[PDB]
């Protein structure tokens with residue numbers, strides 16, 4: 001049987017080619033990897049049948065997408081994921097924030113809510129008490145303490161936005177594929193609510209090939225591989 005993987009370019013794809021694939025091949029499987037530069041196509045490909053499984057999103061994003069597009073897909077297991085971070089732009093230190101400082105952020109809702117929670121934690125803005133952090137939006141901002149100018153861009157553009165803003169909050173997968181380092185972050189998301197999950201069509205939830213893939217992503221071998229290969233990554237809660 002052939003298992004078709006769909007991932008964002010970079011780290012999630014490397015995991016498959018460097019480790020997962022060879023492991024599954026010694027069980028008889030043939031693997032095919034399809035990489036995506038964007039966040040929109042993977043779930044569509046999975047639902048359509050092009051992919052048997054994709055690895056590139058967190059639950060809040062999956063949940064938002066499934067609902068908006070009515071797709072029968074579901075999360076299965078978590079994987080080591082690059083954390084969301086606030087990186088230096090024109091400014092080099094959190095201490096340099098000015099009234100009116102610009103901060104770039106991804107524009108899709110589930111990821112944008114994260115930026116607002118982070119700005120709240122840093123004390124640059126204050127979110128209204130009791131609001132759902134997973135869906136935090138601008139309407140939820142009680143006070144913009146530092147009159148921060150939030151610049152919204154398509155997720156894939158965040159890395160090179162650093163040249164035009166004071167600080168940029170970059171999704172990990174794009175930070176890594178754009179030559180950035182996790183240690184360059186001035187502040188990282190402390191939460192574990194966004195550790196990425198693999199997703200499949202609800203119909204395959206109990207398949208034998210999926211069972212083989214999930215233990216491939218949880219063996220002592222994979223954990224050792226991940227520990228040295230993706231240092232600084234957030235680990236699956238299950239570990």
Ligand code: MET
Nearest residue numbers: 039056057058061171173
């Ligand atoms: C498509 S949701 C964003 C996924 C991205 N790898 C992150 O964890 O920030």
